[PDB]
Design a protein around this ligand. Sequence first.
Ligand SMILES: Cc1cc2nc3c(=O)[nH]c(=O)nc-3n(C[C@H](O)[C@H](O)[C@H](O)COP(=O)(O)OP(=O)(O)OC[C@H]3O[C@@H](n4cnc5c(N)ncnc54)[C@H](O)[C@@H]3O)c2cc1C
Ligand SMILES: Cc1cc2nc3c(=O)[nH]c(=O)nc-3n(C[C@H](O)[C@H](O)[C@H](O)COP(=O)(O)OP(=O)(O)OC[C@H]3O[C@@H](n4cnc5c(N)ncnc54)[C@H](O)[C@@H]3O)c2cc1C
Ligand SMILES: Cc1cc2nc3c(=O)[nH]c(=O)nc-3n(C[C@H](O)[C@H](O)[C@H](O)COP(=O)(O)OP(=O)(O)OC[C@H]3O[C@@H](n4cnc5c(N)ncnc54)[C@H](O)[C@@H]3O)c2cc1C
Ligand SMILES: [Br-]
Ligand SMILES: [Br-]
Ligand SMILES: [Br-]
Ligand SMILES: [Br-]
Ligand SMILES: [Br-]
Ligand SMILES: [Br-]
Ligand SMILES: [Br-]
Ligand SMILES: [Br-]
Ligand SMILES: [Br-]
Ligand SMILES: [Br-]
Ligand SMILES: [Br-]
Ligand SMILES: [Br-]
Ligand SMILES: [Br-]
Ligand code: NA
Lengths: 531, 531, 532
Amino acid sequence: SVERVPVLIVGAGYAGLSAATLLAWRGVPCRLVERRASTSRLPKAHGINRRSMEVLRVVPGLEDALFAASRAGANESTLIIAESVTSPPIETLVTKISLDATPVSPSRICTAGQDRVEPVLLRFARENGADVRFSTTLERFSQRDDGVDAILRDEASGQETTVLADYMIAADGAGGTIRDVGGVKMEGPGVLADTISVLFEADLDSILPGGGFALYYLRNPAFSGAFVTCDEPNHGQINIEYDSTRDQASDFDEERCEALVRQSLGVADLAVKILDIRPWQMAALLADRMSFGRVFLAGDCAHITPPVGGLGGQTAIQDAADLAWKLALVVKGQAAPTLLDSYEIERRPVARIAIARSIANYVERLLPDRQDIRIREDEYGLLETAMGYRYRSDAIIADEFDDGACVEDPLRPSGAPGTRLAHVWLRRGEETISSHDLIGRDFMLFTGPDGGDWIEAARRIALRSKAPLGVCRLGFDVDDPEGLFLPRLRISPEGALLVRPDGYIAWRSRGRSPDPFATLEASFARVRGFD
Amino acid sequence: SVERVPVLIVGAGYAGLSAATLLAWRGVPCRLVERRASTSRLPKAHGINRRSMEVLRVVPGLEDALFAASRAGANESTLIIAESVTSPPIETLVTKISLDATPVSPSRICTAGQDRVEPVLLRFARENGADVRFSTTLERFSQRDDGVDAILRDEASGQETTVLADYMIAADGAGGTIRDVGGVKMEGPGVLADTISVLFEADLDSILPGGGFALYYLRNPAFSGAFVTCDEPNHGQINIEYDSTRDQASDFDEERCEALVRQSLGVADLAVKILDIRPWQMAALLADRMSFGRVFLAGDCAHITPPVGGLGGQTAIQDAADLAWKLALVVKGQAAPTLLDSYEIERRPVARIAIARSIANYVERLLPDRQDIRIREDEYGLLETAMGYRYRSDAIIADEFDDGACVEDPLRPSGAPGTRLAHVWLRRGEETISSHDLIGRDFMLFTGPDGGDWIEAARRIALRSKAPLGVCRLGFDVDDPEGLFLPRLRISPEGALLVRPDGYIAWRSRGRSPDPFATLEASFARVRGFD
Amino acid sequence: SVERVPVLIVGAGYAGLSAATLLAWRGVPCRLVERRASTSRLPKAHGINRRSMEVLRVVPGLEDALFAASRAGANESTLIIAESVTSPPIETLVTKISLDATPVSPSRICTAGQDRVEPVLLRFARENGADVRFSTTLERFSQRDDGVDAILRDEASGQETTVLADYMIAADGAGGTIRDVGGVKMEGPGVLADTISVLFEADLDSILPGGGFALYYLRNPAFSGAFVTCDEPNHGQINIEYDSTRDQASDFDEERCEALVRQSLGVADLAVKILDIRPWQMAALLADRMSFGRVFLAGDCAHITPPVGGLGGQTAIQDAADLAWKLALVVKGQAAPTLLDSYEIERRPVARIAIARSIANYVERLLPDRQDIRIREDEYGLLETAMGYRYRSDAIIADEFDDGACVEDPLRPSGAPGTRLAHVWLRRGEETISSHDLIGRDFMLFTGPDGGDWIEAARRIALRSKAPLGVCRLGFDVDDPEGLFLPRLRISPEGALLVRPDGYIAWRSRGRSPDPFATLEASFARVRGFDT
Ligand SMILES: Cc1cc2nc3c(=O)[nH]c(=O)nc-3n(C[C@H](O)[C@H](O)[C@H](O)COP(=O)(O)OP(=O)(O)OC[C@H]3O[C@@H](n4cnc5c(N)ncnc54)[C@H](O)[C@@H]3O)c2cc1C
Ligand SMILES: Cc1cc2nc3c(=O)[nH]c(=O)nc-3n(C[C@H](O)[C@H](O)[C@H](O)COP(=O)(O)OP(=O)(O)OC[C@H]3O[C@@H](n4cnc5c(N)ncnc54)[C@H](O)[C@@H]3O)c2cc1C
Ligand SMILES: Cc1cc2nc3c(=O)[nH]c(=O)nc-3n(C[C@H](O)[C@H](O)[C@H](O)COP(=O)(O)OP(=O)(O)OC[C@H]3O[C@@H](n4cnc5c(N)ncnc54)[C@H](O)[C@@H]3O)c2cc1C
Ligand SMILES: [Br-]
Ligand SMILES: [Br-]
Ligand SMILES: [Br-]
Ligand SMILES: [Br-]
Ligand SMILES: [Br-]
Ligand SMILES: [Br-]
Ligand SMILES: [Br-]
Ligand SMILES: [Br-]
Ligand SMILES: [Br-]
Ligand SMILES: [Br-]
Ligand SMILES: [Br-]
Ligand SMILES: [Br-]
Ligand SMILES: [Br-]
Ligand code: NA
């Protein structure tokens, strides 16, 4: 049996499920295959940061559903370093007060665990048309010049079928083997720590009186680890590091783990139900390339990060967001296949900074002595890393005076191409909407109120079906009373600003042009891979 | 037989009197000459911010005195934008509740005017041994090999005199011609507005509710300007911009200024007695050099900033305090004269951002239509600009992988070298002091409780070194009960932290060193100009 | 004794000042004479194209100075066809977006006009040792077997002077008479148009939007011409074609040119200050020969091109560069005089297509009505003409199966001997450089990573060959991560590539050689004019 599909996604985690929901929503028929039988697995990741939600909230209903699926609710997150969760805090890294005082995004922080997120993505992936098939395995594949030939295998029978796809998203995890087909090599420090993860049930309401969602980095003299509060109330997980020379994963039975749950919580005796025990590793590795022919590595198969910064799942989501909009343009013929060359160019350095940020969080919060393992070249600030990372590819018309910075303070936007369009409230009559509520579907061209020569130029381009472009004239379609949009992005009232479907600035004009149509038509062509 | 002096100061505004007050307190005999007969002139500036009060409070008694000389007192400051001082607010920028909600400093805001501040500074300069000669003018000068040959002149007789100085601080104001001797070119936007300042007396208690300090930025349809309250009660000041192509300075006689006072106040029946009228310019200019030879430019002669934000007089004070401690070391043989090369490389960027900040306050507050004059690359937060600027020079051992950040949030301190040592309520036994109460006089070495290797290295250093070095070990000399000092500065219990006499961090070690003496000795030598 | 100088250059335009700058930078003492008293003239040309900037950039500081002297800054060029400079464009041929999206060269487009470009060249010629004497004329000359003896004449006085010179670069412009001493015939269409050129001053700021360089081809119903922005702010220049039978050059007084400046600008009520009015012509003529004896014709004196392509000032520069590296070898005794026979062999066909390209642009852009003047036999693409021209001569060891093509697409390089070395971004350690940053001074030998046999041959050659030979290995000295250089030029890792001082490939071996010393020696010798 042989069927064809535009996009084939292998893997039903954060990367693959996001890729399918966004590719579905943007009108691209896809099929997702996943070896497991359901999303039902132990939670690993907790929380969706602001940028992850920005790329996901273009899908109607998705954001509220993610927040409804959470126990703690919006911005209700605390981060503490201590010797145990009942010990005096060594330091307090984040609170609801601190998240509320950083209005850098139309979205707040969502705290939901992976065990709650993956079903909601599956839900919206299917509602918008994705073909998600569980208990189905990519057995093997090869690439002809016009598509991928994939062999699929039913886990219940072993019966095989062939699917032909224009493109395939390898989303197959840290241990994923699709990349080996392409000879990609994971480079980096490698495995830095052996860990053992324990899921337990216990009276957590009393120990943690006023925290909705809590994460404690436990830095004590017996061991190092962390404790997280799960979405199921009175459920929690600890991830304790162990030395593979002094102990072994087999050595952690129910009796021993109940003591670890009590040591890490700072309680002498507490009734602890051990629900599951898992040995894991903490590694730092980056792929040398993130795509080969028509195969695209997304998520943990492209970049393994130390799970200390909580950046792994978010890079996976944003990886899958970058693929979704770009692939949706290529299969519709609104972009050249060359646009897909920009994927590892833009997304790989982002992964290099996450790995470095994550290593730095691990030293600073858990093992401050181990400064040798850090990559201080690539370290940047926490919000800059999650949210101010910059892109530089042929998918972007750089500013003439580009300083080459890897990040930009989201608090001090310059409006340079390659940066994430700033969040600013605007006015659409008596209602107020974020600038981000005006982007995310097609490209968008913002012009100042004197930007009518650009508007007409954009409307001649947007006449074409090949051309996915809309226009917004400031002071006509929406008003910026405070001057915090186009003035702060250094756009004069005769200027124009082009933003991608992922919300990143692609091109700007401080002011007027001798021929606005030719300027814009050439900008628009170039950034979609045409010449 | 010619009079000889270590430092000669020219001019007795904020810059010059600050320089003399601090130079004298630091044991340096100095002479300040000033053309005018006394301090008594009508005041332009109002207020001393928290950073300026921080460099001034190292002088015993000086901080209380300044607060005592003000009509309104600590944090009693209100900033409003409207169409007249009795029109409904258009915005509100600053309140006593806003400034009480920011415990960034050992000091609060002092609202005293120029006409109040300068006599107090004169008081303490002379008290600390400064030689302040009014009615005396620097007529001309020439730098020799071994000093500056100055020709002083008496305004009463025309009699002239020679003094030889090791160094000369040029504090001669926005128009000062000392800089023209050095080829100093002032660069920037230049004159931005023509203004007229009216000092008046009216029943201000009737139409102003609070009894504290009030500043109204005025956006009339007829004119833009500002109203301020003066320290003499029922005295106020309006600084109104005017178009030089439509009206000229001479056109503003008592009658017209009486009309302007009533317009800008909103009461068209109020009796107004015009005490002075003054034309003035609003300008933006920066010097290419802030030193040449043994001459140093401090205050308005080095940087003319628009007077919206009140940064011009605060920079002057802080220029002066930078000179006072570096000069004090160099004339004491305790630093190499190379240290003075750090004056303009540390101070000129601080003035660069203040010029950009004041332009931005001006546009945002008074002329939102003039977005084009802004210098947006150099604009930072209001509290970053006044207080979180950073210093990069050879007077500062920069921590490697420096990101080049021009400011740092005072609220989120990192302890990196070239930043202002954070304010933290420590405990000296039962006394509760500020971290700032332990700095200011000599170089200070803080260390963590396990940092005794540094301490003894420090003590052996100071035996030889010409410059003192104070030490203070945490948990011993002072106590940090809530880990908000050395921990938050990312200094381990075995680390150390070298703070300059101006309170800025010169060098840090996160932990131990294999030869702590050799690293401290090298550091301490390098941060005083030796190589 | 007589004043003796290695190369005498006559004329200080693009050709002559480029020859002087490059000769002096290559170590050749030379004398340039120019009849005029300073470089100060009216701006004619605008722009230095990418290829011209490659041959000029070898001289340290020169490229930065040319961009520094220009009002508009790199790639900030708009070409537009319209009825007036305020009419809606008929077609826009070029934008900065279009120019930035063509990474064919290390250099970008400099927009500086002739009045800016000529002082920069004179400055760099002199910094490098060139002897430039204004208010000096070549009065007459003759050739010997050992040089040209020249009579120089002072314009202030008419005092005359003899100088004997190994070689004489004839760079004396379209009107130049040096070629007539050689009996050089100019051949081709001849004069195609009479034109008048008006230099004016007007508030162009409040008319032109963008603040960069702009050239407008005017398809006005009343007339055909062109407006150009000048480097001096609020200065422009119009080149208006007039019918010599209906009007004559003397009929364009200040009142009429002010009218022209308003029509071709489209602004009815505009203040025009006429600064100069000049009648000119627009011709297409190619020289019989481009050298005779020790005299080499460089610049417009060897090829007059219609000024629509904008290739005449560019061909002059590249003429000069070709002569400069070749004379520099011959006068240093590092190359046989034979090498100079290749000058006109290689440069004349390049002028032939520049003329054909320029005629084709004048017709397409301004007068589409009469294609009868086109030389379609020699028309090629714009970038192919400017940049992808090919050299065939006894100075390039032609590979087997020569196609015969006059041009090659610079975007699809093949590595054939006789083509320009492709611009490839390479890595030297941490820094990223161009392949071109590695060429320009001496002959360069590129080998693959497994080409030590060539490098060893080359280092022993260089040890006693009169000319220097540099070597660079693609595994060691610089890195080519994306295999875009030697793989794409069809060179295996045991191959080598020989590149001339002008950057054109002279010889290639795709694999190993049975005697790598023998083949490299005979190749290095032949490409320098030595026989067998
Ligand atoms: C202890 C821990 C805590 C973490 N905490 C956080 C956190 O707080 N925040 C955060 O953002 N991130 C966190 N992370 C990281 C985050 O969980 C992962 O980065 C993220 O889930 C990776 O998603 P993915 O889609 O790349 O891969 P995966 O979740 O690995 O999914 C890949 C899927 O591929 C399937 N598959 C593989 N091969 C095939 C095949 N041939 N056919 C079919 N299916 C196949 C597998 O069955 C699997 O479901 C944490 C990680 C750990 C270990
Ligand atoms: C309307 C207005 C409002 C302002 N408001 C504020 C505010 O709220 N807050 C604030 O911080 N700043 C404010 N400023 C700015 C502030 O007043 C100045 O920046 C500050 O006074 C500069 O001090 P200075 O010592 O550099 O110079 P000046 O005050 O100009 O003093 C220099 C002195 O040098 C003397 N002098 C010059 N040449 C000689 C010579 N040859 N011999 C002897 N003496 C000489 C002069 O007589 C003069 O007194 C305001 C300015 C204006 C115009
Ligand atoms: C309207 C117009 C626009 C143009 N636009 C462009 C353009 O955009 N781009 C471009 O590349 N080209 C352009 N050109 C062409 C460009 O101007 C020429 O190709 C170039 O300037 C020729 O340089 P040259 O050195 O050959 O000659 P010339 O500029 O003619 O210099 C020759 C010199 O020789 C001197 N001379 C002559 N006889 C003697 C003697 N006996 N002794 C001493 N000195 C002597 C002359 O005084 C003269 O200065 C344009 C031309 C025109 C007319
Ligand atoms: Br975030
Ligand atoms: Br299913
Ligand atoms: Br709970
Ligand atoms: Br992670
Ligand atoms: Br706007
Ligand atoms: Br299109
Ligand atoms: Br002291
Ligand atoms: Br402050
Ligand atoms: Br003076
Ligand atoms: Br000020
Ligand atoms: Br401590
Ligand atoms: Br070109
Ligand atoms: Br031309
Ligand atoms: Na469209």
